[PDB]
Design a protein around this ligand. Structure first.
Ligand SMILES: O=C(O)c1ccc2c(c1)nc(Nc1cccc(Cl)c1)c1ccncc12
Length: 328
């Protein structure tokens, strides 16, 4: 069966308490330190507020977890503990609960985010390299800690374009990687789902995050956001196959012995692999380079095992201007 090319054994080489999140004992702060100011949004199992820490006047974010899916809550809490101090990972400030109802909430640092719909249309070539490099730092960190994020997408990549600060947020779908474990494919947003998820291949790994990152890179350099805009999960794979090719898809399925849902037979058609240069036009030309296209081609590949790791991506020549500037 398939295995990650990197960090495959990191969890088995650590103490069981590192990854056995169900056994984790939470340390609780003081709920009354935090005053809710404004609702930011709502997820399926949580709601997020801007708040003020009344002890230091500082703005924070409070994520109230409800439904209280107790196992999912300990998983997110333990993953955040394991990732503490990691580069560009959202900082968890506190964990509190209502003393009477016991409903728990997470408290995070506040990032003055620029909405990606507006931001992605005005980034320069250097900006794209810079922010992608910062995102890769967070992914290399979490993968090296034995954790897959599983929900990489613009909404979960918060960018303060004034201070040039990036944070990878929302670790509620993240999971520990264990070799040969079969994982639920109902993760990630439709537009960022790797082909392994779309064909119901459960033995995936950290490389799922690199497909999602490649999707973001494509949307930034080409200015089509989202880059692969399927109408549903079936159409999502069709949109991918029109670019990467159908014979190439079948070769990937054959390599990993993946069964293809027969509903695909009537919708996939026959499509050659396309050159990434086909997406260049006058409005995005200044953002595209041989280096960008080479990197993108090494990320948006069917074969999850052949995609660049986060570390390998950071070493790519596309990031040399960032590396050279982070040393001047
Ligand atoms: O879940 C986390 O880890 C998490 C952690 C931090 C933030 C967050 C979610 N969501 C934010 N905003 C937001 C905007 C729209 C909808 C929703 Cl649900 C949330 C936000 C804003 C500013 N600073 C930090 C955060």
């Amino acid at each position: 069966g398939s295995r990650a090319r990197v960090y495959a054994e990191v969890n088995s080489l650590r103490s069981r308490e590192y990854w056995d999140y169900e056994a984790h004992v939470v340390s609780w702060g003081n709920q009354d330190d935090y005053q809710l100011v404004r609702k930011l949004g709502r997820g399926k199992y949580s709601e997020v507020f801007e708040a003020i820490n009344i002890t230091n006047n500082e703005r924070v974010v409070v994520k109230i977890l409800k439904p209280v899916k107790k196992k999912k809550i300990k998983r997110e809490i333990k993953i955040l503990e394991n990732l503490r101090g990691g580069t560009n990972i959202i900082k968890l400030i506190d964990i509190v609960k209502d003393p009477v109802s016991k409903t728990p909430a997470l408290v995070f640092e506040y990032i003055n985010n620029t909405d990606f719909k507006q931001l992605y249309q005005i980034l320069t070539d250097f900006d794209i390299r810079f922010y992608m490099y910062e995102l890769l730092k967070a992914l290399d960190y979490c993968h090296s800690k034995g954790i897959m994020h599983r929900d990489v997408k613009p909404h979960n990549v918060m960018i303060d374009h004034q201070q040039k600060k990036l944070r990878l947020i929302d670790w509620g779908l993240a999971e520990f990687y264990h070799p040969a474990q079969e994982y639920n494919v109902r993760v990630a947003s439709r537009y960022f789902k790797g082909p392994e998820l779309l064909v119901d291949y459960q033995m995936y790994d950290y490389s799922l995050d690199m497909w999602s990152l490649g999707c973001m890179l494509a949307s930034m350099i080409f200015r089509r956001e989202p880059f692969f805009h399927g109408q549903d999960n079936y159409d999502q794979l069709v949109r991918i196959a029109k670019v990467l090719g159908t014979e190439e898809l079948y070769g990937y399925l054959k390599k990993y012995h993946i069964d293809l849902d027969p509903h695909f037979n009537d919708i996939l058609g026959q499509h050659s692999r396309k050159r990434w240069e086909n997406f260049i036009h006058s409005e995005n030309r200044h953002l595209v380079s041989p280096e960008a296209l080479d990197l993108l081609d090494k990320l948006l590949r069917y074969d999850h095992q052949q995609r660049l790791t986060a570390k390998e991506a950071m070493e790519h020549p596309y990031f040399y201007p960032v590396v050279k500037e982070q040393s001047q």
